[PDB]
PDB file of C-alpha atoms in Angstrom:
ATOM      1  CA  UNK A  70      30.940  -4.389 -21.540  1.00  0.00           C
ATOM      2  CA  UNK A  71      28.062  -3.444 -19.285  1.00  0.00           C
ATOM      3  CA  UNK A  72      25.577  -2.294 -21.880  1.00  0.00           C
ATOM      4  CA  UNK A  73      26.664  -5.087 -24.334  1.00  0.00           C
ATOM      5  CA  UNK A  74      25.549  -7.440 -22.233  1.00  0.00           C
ATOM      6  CA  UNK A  75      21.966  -6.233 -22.339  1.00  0.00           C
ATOM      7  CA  UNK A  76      22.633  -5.709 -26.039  1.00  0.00           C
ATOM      8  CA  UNK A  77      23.385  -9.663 -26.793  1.00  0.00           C
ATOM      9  CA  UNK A  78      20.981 -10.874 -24.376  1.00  0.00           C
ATOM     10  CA  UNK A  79      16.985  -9.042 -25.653  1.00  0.00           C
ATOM     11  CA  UNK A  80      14.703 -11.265 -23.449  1.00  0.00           C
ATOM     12  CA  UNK A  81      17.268 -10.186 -20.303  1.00  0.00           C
ATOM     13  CA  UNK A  82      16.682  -6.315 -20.777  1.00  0.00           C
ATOM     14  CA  UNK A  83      13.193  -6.524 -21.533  1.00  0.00           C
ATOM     15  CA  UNK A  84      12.658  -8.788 -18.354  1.00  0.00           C
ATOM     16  CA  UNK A  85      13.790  -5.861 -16.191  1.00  0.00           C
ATOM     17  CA  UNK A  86      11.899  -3.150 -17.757  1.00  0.00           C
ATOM     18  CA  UNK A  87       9.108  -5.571 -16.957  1.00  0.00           C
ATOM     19  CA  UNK A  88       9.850  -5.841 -13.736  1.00  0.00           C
ATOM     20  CA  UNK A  89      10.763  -1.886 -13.041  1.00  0.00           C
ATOM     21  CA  UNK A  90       7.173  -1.576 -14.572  1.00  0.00           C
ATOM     22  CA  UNK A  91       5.304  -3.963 -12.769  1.00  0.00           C
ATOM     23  CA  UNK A  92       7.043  -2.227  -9.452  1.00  0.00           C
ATOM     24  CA  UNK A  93       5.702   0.918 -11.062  1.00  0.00           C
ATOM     25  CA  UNK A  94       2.513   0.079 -11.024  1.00  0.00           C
ATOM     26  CA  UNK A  95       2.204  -1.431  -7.624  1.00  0.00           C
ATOM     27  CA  UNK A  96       3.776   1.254  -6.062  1.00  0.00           C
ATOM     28  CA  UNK A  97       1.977   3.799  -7.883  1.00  0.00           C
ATOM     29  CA  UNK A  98      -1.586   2.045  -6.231  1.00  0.00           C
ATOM     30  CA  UNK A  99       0.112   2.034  -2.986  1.00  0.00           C
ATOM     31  CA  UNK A 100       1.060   5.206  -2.845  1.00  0.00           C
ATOM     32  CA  UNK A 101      -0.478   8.472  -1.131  1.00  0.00           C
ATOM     33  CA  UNK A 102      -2.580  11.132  -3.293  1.00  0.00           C
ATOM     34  CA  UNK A 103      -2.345  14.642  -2.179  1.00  0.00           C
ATOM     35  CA  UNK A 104      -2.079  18.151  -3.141  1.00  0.00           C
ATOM     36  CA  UNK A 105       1.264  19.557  -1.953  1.00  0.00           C
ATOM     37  CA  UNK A 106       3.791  17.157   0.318  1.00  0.00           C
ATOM     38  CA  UNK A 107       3.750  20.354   2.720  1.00  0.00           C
ATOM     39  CA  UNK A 108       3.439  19.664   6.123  1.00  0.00           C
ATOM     40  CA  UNK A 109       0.867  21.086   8.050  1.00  0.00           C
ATOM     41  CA  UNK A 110       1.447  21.973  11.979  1.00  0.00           C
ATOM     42  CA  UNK A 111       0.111  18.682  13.807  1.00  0.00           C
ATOM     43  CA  UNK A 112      -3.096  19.851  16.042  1.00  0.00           C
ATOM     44  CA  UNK A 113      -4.983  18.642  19.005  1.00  0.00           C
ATOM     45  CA  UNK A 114      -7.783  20.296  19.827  1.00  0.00           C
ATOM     46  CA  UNK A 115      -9.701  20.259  23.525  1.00  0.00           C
ATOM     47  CA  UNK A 116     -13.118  21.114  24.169  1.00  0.00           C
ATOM     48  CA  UNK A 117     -15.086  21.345  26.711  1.00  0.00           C
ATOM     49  CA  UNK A 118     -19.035  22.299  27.415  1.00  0.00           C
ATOM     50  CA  UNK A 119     -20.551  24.334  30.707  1.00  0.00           C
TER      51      UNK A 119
ATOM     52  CA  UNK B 293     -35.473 -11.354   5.712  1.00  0.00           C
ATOM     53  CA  UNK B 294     -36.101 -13.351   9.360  1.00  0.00           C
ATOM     54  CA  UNK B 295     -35.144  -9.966  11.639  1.00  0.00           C
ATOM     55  CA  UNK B 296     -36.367  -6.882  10.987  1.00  0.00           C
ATOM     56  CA  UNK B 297     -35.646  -3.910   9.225  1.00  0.00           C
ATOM     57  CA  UNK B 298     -35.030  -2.437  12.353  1.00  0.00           C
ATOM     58  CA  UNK B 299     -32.317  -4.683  13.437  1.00  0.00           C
ATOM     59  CA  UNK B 300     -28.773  -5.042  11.559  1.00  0.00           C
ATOM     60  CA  UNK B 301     -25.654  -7.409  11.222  1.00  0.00           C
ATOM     61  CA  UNK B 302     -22.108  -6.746  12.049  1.00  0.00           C
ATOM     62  CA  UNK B 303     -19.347  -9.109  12.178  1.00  0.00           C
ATOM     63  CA  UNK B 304     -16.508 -10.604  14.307  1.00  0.00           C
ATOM     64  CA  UNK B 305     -13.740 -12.174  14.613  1.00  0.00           C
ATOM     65  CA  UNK B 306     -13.119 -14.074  10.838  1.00  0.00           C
ATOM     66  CA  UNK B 307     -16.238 -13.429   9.765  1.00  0.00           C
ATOM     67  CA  UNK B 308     -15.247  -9.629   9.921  1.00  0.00           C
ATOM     68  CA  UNK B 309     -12.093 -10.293   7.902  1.00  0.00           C
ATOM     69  CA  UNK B 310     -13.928 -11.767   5.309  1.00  0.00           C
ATOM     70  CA  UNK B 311     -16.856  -9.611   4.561  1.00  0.00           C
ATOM     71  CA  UNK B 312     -13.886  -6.976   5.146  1.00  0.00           C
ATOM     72  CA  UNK B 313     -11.009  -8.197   2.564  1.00  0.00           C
ATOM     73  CA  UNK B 314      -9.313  -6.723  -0.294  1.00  0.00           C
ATOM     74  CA  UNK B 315      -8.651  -9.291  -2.427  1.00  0.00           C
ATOM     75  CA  UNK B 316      -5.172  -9.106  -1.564  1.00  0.00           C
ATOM     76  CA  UNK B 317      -3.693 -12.637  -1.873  1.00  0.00           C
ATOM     77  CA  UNK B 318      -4.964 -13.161  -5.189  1.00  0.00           C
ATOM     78  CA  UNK B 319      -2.959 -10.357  -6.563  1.00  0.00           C
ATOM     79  CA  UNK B 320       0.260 -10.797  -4.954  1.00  0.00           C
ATOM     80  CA  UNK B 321      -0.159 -14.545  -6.149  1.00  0.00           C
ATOM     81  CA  UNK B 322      -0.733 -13.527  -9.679  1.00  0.00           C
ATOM     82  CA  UNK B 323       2.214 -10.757  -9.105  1.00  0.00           C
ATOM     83  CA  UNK B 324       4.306 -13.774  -7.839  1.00  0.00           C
ATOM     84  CA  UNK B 325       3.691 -15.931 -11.045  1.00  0.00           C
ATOM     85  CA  UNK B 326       4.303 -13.441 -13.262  1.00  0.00           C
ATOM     86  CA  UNK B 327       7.395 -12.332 -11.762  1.00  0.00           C
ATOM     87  CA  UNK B 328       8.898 -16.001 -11.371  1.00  0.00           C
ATOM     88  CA  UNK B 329       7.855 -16.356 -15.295  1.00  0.00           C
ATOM     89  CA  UNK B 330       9.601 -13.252 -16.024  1.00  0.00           C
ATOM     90  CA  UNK B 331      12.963 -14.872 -13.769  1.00  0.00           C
ATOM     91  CA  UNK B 332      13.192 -17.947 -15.543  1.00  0.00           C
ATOM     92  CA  UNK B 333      12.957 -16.334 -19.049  1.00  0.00           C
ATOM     93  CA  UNK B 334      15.708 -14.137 -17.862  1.00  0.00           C
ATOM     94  CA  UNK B 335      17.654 -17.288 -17.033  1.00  0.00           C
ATOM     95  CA  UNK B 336      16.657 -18.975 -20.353  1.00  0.00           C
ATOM     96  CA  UNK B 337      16.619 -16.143 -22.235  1.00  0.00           C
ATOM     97  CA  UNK B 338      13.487 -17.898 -24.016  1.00  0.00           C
ATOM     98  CA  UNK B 339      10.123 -16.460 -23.952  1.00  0.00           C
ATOM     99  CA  UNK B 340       8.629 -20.473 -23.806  1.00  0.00           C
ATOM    100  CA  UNK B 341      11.109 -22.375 -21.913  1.00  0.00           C
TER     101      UNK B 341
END
């Protein structure tokens, strides 16, 4: 029943595709480039001059 | 032109925020009307209506 009900209503499933795009594409633009998703040790680092 | 090339501008307060804006509104709005368009051919299941 589920996946007839997409079947007898076209405009419905394509709406949502849309929309899962659309969401796609934002999010892709939001989202953070980067190399590897490791996590490097967090650092603070002191100086001081004499 | 009037100042020199010596001096420079900066801004504050809403002057920064709008010499420093991203457009944003104007694509959530169009975002917004095509998602509502995309709703209510969902409910219709017509492309026009």
């Amino acid at each position: 029943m589920f996946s007839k009900f997409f079947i007898e209503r076209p405009i419905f499933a394509s709406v949502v595709a849309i929309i899962i795009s659309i969401a796609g594409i934002i999010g892709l633009a939001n989202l953070p480039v980067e190399q590897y998703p490791s996590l490097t040790p967090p650092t603070v680092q002191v100086s001081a001059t004499y | 032109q009037s100042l020199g090339d010596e001096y420079s501008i900066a801004w504050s307060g809403s002057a920064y925020q709008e010499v420093s804006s991203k457009g944003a509104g104007a694509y959530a709005f169009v975002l917004g009307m095509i998602f509502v368009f995309l709703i209510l051919a969902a409910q219709y299941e017509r492309w026009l209506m």
